[PDB]
Design an enzyme around this catalytic site. Structure first.
Site, PDB file in Angstrom:
ATOM      1  N   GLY A   1       0.768  -1.227   0.000  1.00  0.00           N
ATOM      2  CA  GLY A   1       0.000   0.000   0.000  1.00  0.00           C
ATOM      3  C   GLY A   1       0.813   1.299   0.000  1.00  0.00           C
ATOM      4  O   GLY A   1       2.025   1.310   0.207  1.00  0.00           O
ATOM      5  N   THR A   2       0.108   2.387  -0.285  1.00  0.00           N
ATOM      6  CA  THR A   2       0.556   3.757  -0.104  1.00  0.00           C
ATOM      7  C   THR A   2       1.166   4.007   1.277  1.00  0.00           C
ATOM      8  O   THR A   2       0.726   3.455   2.269  1.00  0.00           O
ATOM      9  CB  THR A   2      -0.688   4.624  -0.217  1.00  0.00           C
ATOM     10  OG1 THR A   2      -0.970   4.847  -1.596  1.00  0.00           O
ATOM     11  CG2 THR A   2      -0.531   5.899   0.504  1.00  0.00           C
ATOM     12  N   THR A   3       2.169   4.862   1.370  1.00  0.00           N
ATOM     13  CA  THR A   3       2.670   5.149   2.705  1.00  0.00           C
ATOM     14  C   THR A   3       1.763   6.122   3.507  1.00  0.00           C
ATOM     15  O   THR A   3       1.102   7.017   2.971  1.00  0.00           O
ATOM     16  CB  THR A   3       4.224   5.331   2.772  1.00  0.00           C
ATOM     17  OG1 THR A   3       4.585   6.377   3.677  1.00  0.00           O
ATOM     18  CG2 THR A   3       4.837   5.558   1.411  1.00  0.00           C
TER      19      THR A   3
ATOM     20  N   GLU B   1       0.084   9.551   1.593  1.00  0.00           N
ATOM     21  CA  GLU B   1       0.368   9.658   0.178  1.00  0.00           C
ATOM     22  C   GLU B   1      -0.833   9.135  -0.623  1.00  0.00           C
ATOM     23  O   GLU B   1      -1.258   8.007  -0.417  1.00  0.00           O
ATOM     24  CB  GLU B   1       1.672   8.869  -0.105  1.00  0.00           C
ATOM     25  CG  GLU B   1       1.801   8.193  -1.474  1.00  0.00           C
ATOM     26  CD  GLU B   1       3.117   7.441  -1.662  1.00  0.00           C
ATOM     27  OE1 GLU B   1       3.747   7.652  -2.710  1.00  0.00           O
ATOM     28  OE2 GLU B   1       3.529   6.633  -0.799  1.00  0.00           O
TER      29      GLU B   1
ATOM     30  N   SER C   1      -2.835   1.947   5.407  1.00  0.00           N
ATOM     31  CA  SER C   1      -2.324   1.506   4.099  1.00  0.00           C
ATOM     32  C   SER C   1      -2.698   0.062   3.858  1.00  0.00           C
ATOM     33  O   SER C   1      -2.678  -0.748   4.773  1.00  0.00           O
ATOM     34  CB  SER C   1      -0.814   1.590   4.026  1.00  0.00           C
ATOM     35  OG  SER C   1      -0.297   2.657   4.800  1.00  0.00           O
TER      36      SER C   1
END
Lengths: 242, 250, 111, 233, 243, 241, 244, 244, 198
Positions: G30-32, G47, G75
């Site tokens: 996942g996205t941070t 993010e 995330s």
């Protein structure tokens, strides 16, 4: 093993596709929609000579203005017909009117994916899809004469003509050719009789095939054998004319 | 959430075996030895405490249990399975019997209630069989003294004497040789002690052996006086001292 | 003891002309000898060319009307936008009312 | 990999994938293309309808959910019938109870959470339909994309179905232009029919074949089919 | 396949592999604990390790206040540990409410040991990967240590230790008790009993500790509580003088 | 809450559990029904495997469902008792609410529906049974004979057989039963029924039961003598040849 | 023989739940997202990848409010996160209903903890495919937590999860060292923007949008609030300026 | 999830048999032989105890012969504990019937009910079937002395003489050879024991290895009586019939 | 209430049951037959509350007919009466109890005797040589106590009923429009077509 509602890596539900296989093994059923009415025909296909063929009931009435023909595992169709009748009679009870052919078809198709093993949707228990396709034909005041193909995937198409069952791509090619918008009822009757005649293993007679229609005036009638005999005669005669 | 294991975990294999019951009996096989001997005026049940640490306090872990004032049980196999069986047996003695007839169940009836709980774990959805064999010793007015064995299958059988667990083939052989229909309770206690010595590796004494009897009424254990038709429990765990007192006579 | 019903007053009148219909009502809403409002409409356009009034206990009246309007909405979704003819409306309403046969909407209703 | 882990929605693959979800995702990719796009005043859906024969009807891809909201589908049609039906009820509830038009954004959250429940429990299956939701609410025009993974995204324009990538590039290029078609319903629709054409390798968009729906500022969600789309081919 | 190794049914050697595997899990934290009994108190010491600098050290704990009187230290993964904690708290409150007295340590242990026995028997529930050590000064039995495991076993202890280096501590305590010939630490003050625990932990393991490398719980009559970093420091200082 | 789907579609579109249920029927004792001008006769074979039987008490193979309709079967005996019971409860329920007994077709439709349903419900296997249902509609003199099978399919038959070696005995009836000229007597209808079993029973005086059903609730089982008389007469006629 | 990983609540022979470990993989993918505790509050940042120009900017909000004083960010699988938050919302409502006071953050952490743990007990469910950073202010301070798919959680000084978690951690450790008496809500906000910007080198292939929220006693009155307009822009500048 | 561990106990083989039923019958074939014989004036039930030991209390023991009613008894072959489950419900049924009608339950009605309970485990539920075969000896005023048998499938049939458990084909052959319709009970006692004695896998047939019962018209009365033979009585009759 | 009288003579059971059906202010019917044949040798007459009456009888009839077919056998009168008694005893503690009183007249073929059972809606069953429900006993018991012999033919039984009915038509304030009279014996159940002029 593997669950009843798994998708294949191609995006199709296994049980539904296999169900479609069972339908290909079924007796042929043909519907043709004209401005004078809808005609529904079926090959009876008695499995042995000592079977009384009038007890083969593959065309049934749903209401005065809606009938249907079945093909595949026909015992699977009994509860669909029951739900169907109930839905038409109930609609009339709540609204003092006839149910539209479409809404009736839609109601029958809602049963279709109601199968599983204690699932994550609602409270819908039935162990497997249905193994039978239906041709639903009727009349209603908004959209006239209508023919529908109700499948076990839950989708239903409107058709001007449609064949289902073992002789089906053969006969569908055939209907692709013969069907035009100004067909008369008698023409449709003759056309359905001809195409069952082509795709049947047996020699078509009034005992191994059956005709019915729906019109706005007289409703849905299964033709008795005498009436269909005459129409077979008429068809042999018209073919023997070039 | 929700037990969706509602099919049997024990079923029949091609040869007729019920694997899980067989495997449960195997677990019992490796259990510490326990035994029962019935005399004309009582029953004795015994087993080794096989403490799992000398840092453990072995008297906080009874393998011999009262089920009713006149019935006690011992086991071989999985202790935690035994413990909950005891809970359920004490309870059933009340709900299926004491709250109905106002008396405690006779030994065979209690045994048959235990056996049924065990049978059900052999067939109900989503469980395994109990990994124990019980010996249940008791007295009741109309049947006298008795001793019953109950296995993972739920089968029970009455015995004059028997052993279950680790060294039971030898112990049963030792018992067939020493048992007769005339033994008095002290004699049985004595045999039990001798039979046990054969199966016990280390120290053998009132701290490492556990022994109870079903004998006379002990009015001094009732807790009240003034109702002459209550004479108190026939079940009594022997103390460490009582046991040692009897290993000099060994 | 709690009385689940009340009476909001009002009088309503429906007349069928040969090619028109009128449904009329006063706008006074009362409670005993007090006026709650001098203008509280009570006759509603329900869609598909149907007007409805449910007179008597207003809380029941509003519930009923609201439920019928909602039924017109669902009729459209389920029947491919078909028009709900007056006779079909009437039968529908009978089922709405009778559904509460043992705890009735306390209203006289006119469409 | 795949093999042992795609048997039900309750199993992660060793890289952390959910295969039954991806397989359902796969049924979308083979649906007939449909495009959504919107300006500040309207939102438009255009879908290509598939028939079965030349004897069959073309299957409908647009479903109306309320006066101000509606959607298009690609994938399993009966799944769309279920989800849009739920959306119909969510809209209806909001009006009945709060006297309030359901925000297009809440609609997306509700669809996401319904989808999600079918990806974490035993005996369920994911939905196998993708959805484009247009609406006009108290904050204006909106287009949403729903994937049966439960992912719901708010966008200016998008396409889903087979060869949707065409339309998606076209729109990504047209962005600054089509976003500005304010108060011109017909232009925006024409912009949508252009987008959808980027996805026909196929053949040619015709009158029993094209479907268009529109919603906006003084315009209830409405659907055009047949002679009613003639002026756009 | 090897189905008998995935759910809690018997292997053909009559074993429950899932239960054995659950015991393995109890060691994943690599924390050792020990408990000893005073004259009138009960002491549990547990190692405290905080690998990450981004952590709030005040929230890393394997010692739980179960009831006014009962404390519990867990050896095992934190989430199983907290599942056990919340349950024991619920059980201790309901017992009190249903029967009008505080749940005894031994009886809580029996109850949680029974819950565990069930995971051992019903297929649909996994065992928990934890060993639970319960301590109090019970009103009838005095200072108490009862320890339960994923098999549903439990017993009482004079003292006990748990974790990867369980045995070193175990043998150290056995040696102490072979010498002292009694079944408790003979000190009047809990302070000293904490001092004995830490001392024997240091000798058994071969390590020094700062005030942040331990976590300490003490039961006395009608209270169980844990020591602050500062409370512990005072105790480390004390052991260091005279020694 | 046990609801595993045991009857499912496999890739060529078969339902194996229903197919296999027919395999049970295949292995069952032969049953035959033949209809006459004004009668229907049901014949069944008994096994020879063990003949220390007490035939007074052993469940017979033909069961009355009501005073005017009977049912026999081939397949799993225990499964058949579930269908017979449901059938009997339903015939009483029909009389109670409709104030007329069931028509033979109605009773057949009922049993087949039960059979069909056990092929699409969770946690059940299909019945391992096919049935022959026979009798007379109330106030009707025209005989009825129907057949059901595990799938739930039913239909009527001029004459029909099910179970082991039913191929042989079918073959017999297909070239011994004339639709223009159905057996005119009870006597000749029974004869044809016994004749047809004799293709497959092989020395079966007492290894053949027969049930005769006539209009207006007149059902009667034939005794060993009466049936034996029929076997005797068939042998003598075979030996002018 | 093996296959210890095909089914959710099965212990492997070394005592591990492979399904949980695979759920971590979806998180890592996942996205941070991050959280920084300041000395009167907490700041959350994340993010959001711009897959395309077509995503309406500012509109697909990732951070969620629970009650009035709790922020959570996560995330991994986004729908799982929402489902976690729906549960958190029920869980805080119930607590408030019964006890009148808003749920203390430690109490609230355990509610999520128990629920997420629950999803490792049975094979009829799957574990959560998220890690959740969450926290807020209560009757005695700020609190920041992170909660793994196993249901493990602790209190943090700063926390990070997703694709960029290594840079984020290293950045966060630097802060903790170079400000040993605390950081302010204002500083934390900027510092968050920075870390998200640095974190974005492992997803260097796509464009991103920054999202920030905070809950601070002095700056938001102990109520959770999204960082909007001027403060968001200032924060963006700081990170842009400090990237070179 | 759980699907994987389901044996599917209620399905057909491709040959159309029920696996669990056949496997259960296999199990039954290893059990002590039970014999029941019917006569004009009575019924005999004889059965071999499988395994003994000199320490087994024969006085307090019942593994084979159980009373259902004052007029009905069964012999068991298979899993004892399973048989007790069934026997207890059969006892309840007989009483229900008595309560409802004020008449003792006719033998068939009781036999059919029990067999139906057995059949269910074969068709729904997913549970292992009962590993039991019964011989039922009973008397009612409709059919007099009746003998039935039922196995794990829940099929039942009636008999003049029958065996269940081990060696039934050997036993059945012997019985078929010497059984005669006009046999009197005393004869049947002899036949039953002679048959067991010839068919055993034990070295000989001693009293300590048998259970034994008769249902007679009681000799002196006018009404029916069940005699479950005490160990001594078995020893006596074993000598009377010359097997010592 | 309605008139429900039974008498058991030597060889048969006679049931007599009034023909009127009144709803409040009008007699809606003068030919109502308050009886259901349960089995070919078992008859049940009934009186009590309006719909319950026939619902109950018909429900009983269904069950006995079910048993008859299941068992291929005809339950004894005593067996049938116990079944019925249990049903009524259930009903008295249910949500809405059947308010129905019955006489059961049966000829037991195994014993070769007729049997008459009186059961009220509480499930209070008694076997009796003669009986009645409601008020009918108050006018007729004293005649029946007088003339009754257990040795009576069927014909004496009828004359004795005739008398009973005449005492009713004299002293009872309601016009019940006469009785339908049925006999149960070894040969089954027949209706006396003439009690109007017999």
């Amino acid at each position: 093993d593997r669950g009843v509602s798994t998708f294949s890596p191609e995006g199709r539900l296994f049980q539904v596709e296999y169900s479609l296989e069972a339908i290909k093994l079924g007796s042929t059923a043909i519907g043709i929609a004209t401005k004078e009415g809808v005609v529904l025909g079926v090959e009876k296909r008695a499995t042995s000579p000592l079977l009384e063929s009038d007890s083969i009931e593959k065309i049934v009435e749903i209401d005065r203005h809606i009938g249907c023909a079945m093909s595949g595992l026909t015992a699977d169709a009994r509860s669909m017909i029951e739900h169907a009748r109930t839905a038409a009679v109930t609609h009339n009870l709540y609204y003092d009117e006839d149910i539209n052919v479409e809404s009736l078809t839609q109601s029958v198709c809602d049963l279709a994916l109601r199968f599983g093993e204690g699932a994550s949707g609602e409270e819908r228990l039935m162990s497997r899809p249905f193994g039978v396709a239906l041709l639903i034909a009727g009349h209603d005041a908004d959209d006239g004469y209508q023919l529908f193909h109700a499948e076990p995937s839950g989708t239903f198409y409107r058709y001007n003509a449609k064949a289902i069952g073992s002789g089906s791509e053969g006969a569908q090619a055939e209907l692709l050719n013969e069907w035009h918008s100004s067909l008369t009822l008698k023409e449709a009757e003759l056309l359905v009789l001809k195409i069952l005649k082509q795709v049947m293993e047996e020699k078509l007679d009034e005992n191994n095939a059956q005709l019915s229609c729906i019109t706005k005036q007289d409703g849905f009638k299964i033709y008795d054998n005498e009436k269909t005999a005459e129409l077979i005669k008429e068809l042999k005669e018209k073919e023997a004319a070039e | 959430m929700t037990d969706r294991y509602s099919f049997s975990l024990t079923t029949f294999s091609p040869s007729g075996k019920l694997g899980q019951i067989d495997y449960a009996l195997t677990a019992v096989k490796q259990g510490v030895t326990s035994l029962g001997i019935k005399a004309t005026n009582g029953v004795v049940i015994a087993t080794e405490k096989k403490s799992s640490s000398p840092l453990a306090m072995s008297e906080t872990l009874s393998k011999v249990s009262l089920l009713t004032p006149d019935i006690g049980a011992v086991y071989s196999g999985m202790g935690p399975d035994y413990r909950v069986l005891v809970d359920k047996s004490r309870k059933v003695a009340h709900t299926s019997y004491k709250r109905i007839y106002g008396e405690y169940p006779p030994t065979k009836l209690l045994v048959s209630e235990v056996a049924k709980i065990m049978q059900e774990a052999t067939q109900s959805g989503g469980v395994r069989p109990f990994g124990v064999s019980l010996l249940i010793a008791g007295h009741d007015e109309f049947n006298g003294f008795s001793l019953y064995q109950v296995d993972p299958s739920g089968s029970y059988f009455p015995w004059k004497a028997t052993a279950i667990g680790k060294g039971s083939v030898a112990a049963k052989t030792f018992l067939e040789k020493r048992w007769n229909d005339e033994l008095e309770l002290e004699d049985a206690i004595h045999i039990a002690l001798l039979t046990l010595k054969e199966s016990v590796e280390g120290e053998f004494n009132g701290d490492t052996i556990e022994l109870a009897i079903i004998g006379d009424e002990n009015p001094d254990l009732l807790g009240y006086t003034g109702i002459p038709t209550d004479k108190g429990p026939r079940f009594r765990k022997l103390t460490s001292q009582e046991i040692n007192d009897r290993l000099e006579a060994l | 003891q709690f009385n689940p019903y009340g009476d909001n007053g009002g009088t309503i009148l429906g007349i069928a002309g040969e090619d028109f219909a009128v449904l009329a009502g006063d706008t006074r809403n009362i409670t005993d000898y007090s006026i709650n409002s001098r203008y509280e409409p009570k006759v509603f356009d329900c869609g598909d060319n149907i007007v409805m009034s449910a007179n008597g206990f207003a809380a029941d009246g509003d519930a009923l009307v609201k439920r019928f309007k909602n039924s017109v909405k669902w009729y459209h979704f389920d029947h491919n936008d078909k028009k709900l003819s007056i006779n079909s409306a009437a039968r529908n309403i009978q089922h709405l009312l009778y559904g509460k046969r043992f705890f009735p909407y306390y209203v006289h209703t006119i469409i | 990999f795949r093999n042992n882990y795609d048997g039900d929605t309750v199993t992660f693959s060793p890289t952390g994938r959910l295969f039954q979800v991806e397989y359902a995702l796969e049924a979308i990719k083979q649906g007939s293309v449909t495009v959504g796009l919107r300006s500040n005043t309207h939102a438009v859906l255009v879908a290509l309808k598939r028939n079965a024969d030349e004897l069959s009807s073309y299957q409908k891809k647009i479903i109306k959910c309320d006066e101000h909201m509606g959607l298009s589908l690609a994938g399993l049609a009966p799944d769309a019938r279920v989800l849009s039906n739920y959306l119909r009820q969510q809209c209806n509830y909001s009006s009945l109870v709060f006297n309030r038009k359901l925000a297009v954004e809440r609609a997306g959250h509700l669809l996401c959470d319904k989808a999600q429940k079918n990806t974490q429990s035993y005996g369920g299956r994911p939905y196998g339909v993708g959805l484009l939701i247009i609406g006009y609410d108290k904050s204006g025009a909106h287009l949403l994309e729903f994937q049966p993974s439960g992912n719901v995204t708010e966008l200016y324009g998008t396409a889903i179905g087979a060869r949707s990538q065409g339309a998606k590039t076209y729109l990504e290029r047209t962005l600054d232009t089509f976003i500005k078609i304010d108060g011109n319903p017909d232009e925006l629709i024409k912009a949508g029919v252009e987008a959808i054409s980027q996805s026909l390798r196929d053949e040619s968009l015709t009158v029993d074949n094209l479907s268009i729906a529109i919603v906006g500022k003084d315009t209830p969600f409405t659907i055009y089919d047949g002679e009613a789309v003639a002026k756009y081919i | 396949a090897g189905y008998d190794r995935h759910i809690t049914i018997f292997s053909p050697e009559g074993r429950l592999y899932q239960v054995e595997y659950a015991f393995k899990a109890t060691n994943q934290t690599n924390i050792n604990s020990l408990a000893v009994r005073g004259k009138d108190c009960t002491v549990v010491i547990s190692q405290k390790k905080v690998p990450d600098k981004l952590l709030d050290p005040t929230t890393v704990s394997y010692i739980f206040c179960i009831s006014r009187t009962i404390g519990m230290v867990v050896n095992g993964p934190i989430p199983d540990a907290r599942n056990a904690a919340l349950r024991a708290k619920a059980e201790a409150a309901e017992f009190r409410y249903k029967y009008g007295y505080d749940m005894p340590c031994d009886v809580l242990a029996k109850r949680m040991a029974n819950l565990s026995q069930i995971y051992t028997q019903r297929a649909y529930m996994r065992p928990l990967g934890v060993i639970l050590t319960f301590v109090s000064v019970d009103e009838e039995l005095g200072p108490s240590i009862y320890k339960t495991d994923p098999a549903g076993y439990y017993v009482g202890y004079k003292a006990t230790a748990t974790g990867p280096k369980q045995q070193e501590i175990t043998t150290n305590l056995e040696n102490h008790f072979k010498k002292s010939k009694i079944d408790h630490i003979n000190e009047e003050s809990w302070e000293k009993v904490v001092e004995f625990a830490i001392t024997h932990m240091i000798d058994a393991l071969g390590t020094e500790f700062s005030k942040n490398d331990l976590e300490v719980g003490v039961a006395t009559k009608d209270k169980f509580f844990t020591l602050s970093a500062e409370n512990i420091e005072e105790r480390l200082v004390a052991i260091a003088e005279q020694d | 809450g046990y609801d595993r789907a045991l009857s499912i579609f496999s890739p060529d579109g078969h339902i194996f559990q229903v197919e296999y249920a027919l395999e049970a029927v295949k292995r069952g004792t032969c049953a035959v029904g033949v209809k006459g001008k004004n009668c229907v006769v049901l014949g069944c074979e008994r096994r020879s495997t063990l003949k220390l039987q007490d035939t007074r008490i052993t469940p017979s193979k033909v069961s009355k469902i009501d005073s005017h309709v009977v049912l026999s079967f081939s397949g799993l005996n225990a499964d058949s008792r579930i269908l017979i019971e449901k059938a009997r409860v339903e015939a009483q329920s029909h009389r109670l609410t409709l104030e007329d007994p069931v028509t033979v077709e109605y009773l057949t439709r009922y049993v087949a529906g039960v059979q069909q349903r056990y092929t699409q419900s969770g946690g059940v296997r299909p019945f391992g049974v096919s049935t022959l249902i026979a009798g007379f509609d109330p106030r009707d003199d025209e005989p009825k004979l129907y057949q059901t099978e595990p799938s739930g399919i039913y239909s009527s038959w001029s004459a029909q057989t099910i179970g082991r070696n039913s191929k042989t005995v079918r073959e017999f009836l297909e070239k011994n039963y004339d639709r223009k000229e159905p057996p005119a007597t009870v006597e000749e209808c029974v004869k044809l029924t016994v004749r047809s079993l004799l293709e497959v029973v092989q020395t079966g005086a007492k290894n053949i039961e027969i049930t005769v059903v006539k209009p207006d609730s007149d059902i009667v089982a034939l005794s060993s003598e009466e049936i034996n008389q029929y076997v005797t007469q068939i042998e003598q006629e075979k030996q002018e040849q | 023989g093996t296959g210890y990983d095909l089914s959710n609540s099965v212990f492997s022979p070394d005592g591990r739940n492979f399904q949980v470990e695979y759920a971590v993989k979806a998180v890592e993918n996942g996205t941070t997202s991050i959280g920084i505790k300041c000395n009167d509050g907490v700041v959350f940042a994340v993010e959001k990848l711009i897959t395309s120009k077509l995503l309406v900017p500012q509109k697909n909000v990732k951070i969620q409010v629970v009650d009035r004083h709790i922020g959570c960010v996560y995330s991994g699988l986004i729908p799982d996160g929402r489902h976690l938050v729906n549960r958190g919302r029920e869980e805080a409502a119930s607590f408030k209903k019964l006890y009148k006071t808003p749920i203390p953050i430690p109490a609230f952490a355990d509610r999520l903890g128990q629920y997420v743990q629950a999803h490792t007990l049975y094979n009829s469910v799957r574990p959560f495919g998220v890690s959740t950073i969450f926290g807020g202010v209560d009757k005695n301070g700020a609190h920041l937590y992170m909660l793994e798919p196993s249901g493990s959680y602790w209190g943090y000084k700063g926390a990070a999860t997703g694709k960029g978690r290594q840079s984020a951690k290293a950045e966060l450790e630097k802060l903790v060292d170079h400000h040993p008496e605390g950081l302010s809500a204002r500083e934390a906000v900027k510092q968050a923007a920075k870390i998200i910007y640095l974190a974005h080198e492992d997803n260097k292939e796509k464009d991103f949008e920054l999202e920030i929220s905070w809950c601070s006693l002095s700056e938001t009155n102990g109520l959770h609030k999204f960082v909007k307009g001027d403060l968001l822009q200032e924060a963006i500048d700081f990170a842009q300026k400090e990237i070179n | 999830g759980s699907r994987r561990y389901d044996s599917r106990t209620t399905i057909f083989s491709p040959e159309g048999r029920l696996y669990q039923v056949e496997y259960a019958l296999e199990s039954i074939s290893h059990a002590g032989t039970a014999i029941g014989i019917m006569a004009s004036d009575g019924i005999v039930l004889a059965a071999e105890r499988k395994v003994t030991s000199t320490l087994l209390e024969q006085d307090t023991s019942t593994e084979k012969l159980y009373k259902l009613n004052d007029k009905i008894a069964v012999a068991v072959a298979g899993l004892t504990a399973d048989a007790e489950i069934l026997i207890n419900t059969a006892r309840i049924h007989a009483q229900n019937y008595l309560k409802t009608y004020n008449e003792d339950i006719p033998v068939e009605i009781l036999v059919r009910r029990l067999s139906d309970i057995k059949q269910g485990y074969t068709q729904h539920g997913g549970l292992r079937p009962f590993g039991v075969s019964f011989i039922y000896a009973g008397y009612d005023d409709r059919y007099g002395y009746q003998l039935y048998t039922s196995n794990p499938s829940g099929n039942y049939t009636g008999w003049k003489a029958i065996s269940v458990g081990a060696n039934t084909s050997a036993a059945q052959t012997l019985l078929q050879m010497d059984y005669k319709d006009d046999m009197k009970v005393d004869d049947a006692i002899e036949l039953a024991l002679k048959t067991l004695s010839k068919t055993t896998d034990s070295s000989a047939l001693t009293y300590d290895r048998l259970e034994f019962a008769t249902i007679r018209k009681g000799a002196n009365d006018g009404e029916v009586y069940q005699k479950i033979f005490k160990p001594q009585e078995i020893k006596d009759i074993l000598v009377k019939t010359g097997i010592t | 209430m309605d008139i429900i009288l039974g008498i058991r003579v030597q060889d048969s059971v006679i049931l007599a049951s009034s023909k009127a059906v009144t709803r409040g202010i009008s007699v809606l019917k003068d030919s109502d037959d308050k009886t259901r044949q349960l089995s070919p040798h078992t008859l049940m007459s009934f009186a009590g509350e309006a719909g319950d009456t026939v619902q109950f009888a018909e429900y009983i009839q269904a069950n006995i007919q079910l048993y008859s077919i299941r068992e291929d056998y005809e339950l004894s009168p005593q067996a049938v009466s116990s079944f019925v008694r249990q049903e009524l005893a259930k009903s008295i503690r249910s949500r809405r109890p059947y308010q129905v009183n019955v006489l059961i007249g049966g000829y037991d073929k195994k014993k070769n005797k007729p049997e008459l059972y009186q059961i009220d809606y509480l499930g209070t069953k008694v076997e009796l040589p003669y009986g009645a429900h409601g008020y009918s006993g108050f006018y007729t018991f004293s005649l029946l106590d007088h003339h009754y012999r257990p040795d009576m033919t069927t014909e004496e039984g009828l004359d004795l009923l005739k008398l009973c009915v005449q005492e009713l038509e004299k002293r009872m304030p309601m016009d019940f429009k006469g009785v339908i009279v049925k006999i149960v014996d070894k040969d089954g159940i027949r209706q006396v077509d003439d009690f109007q002029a017999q």
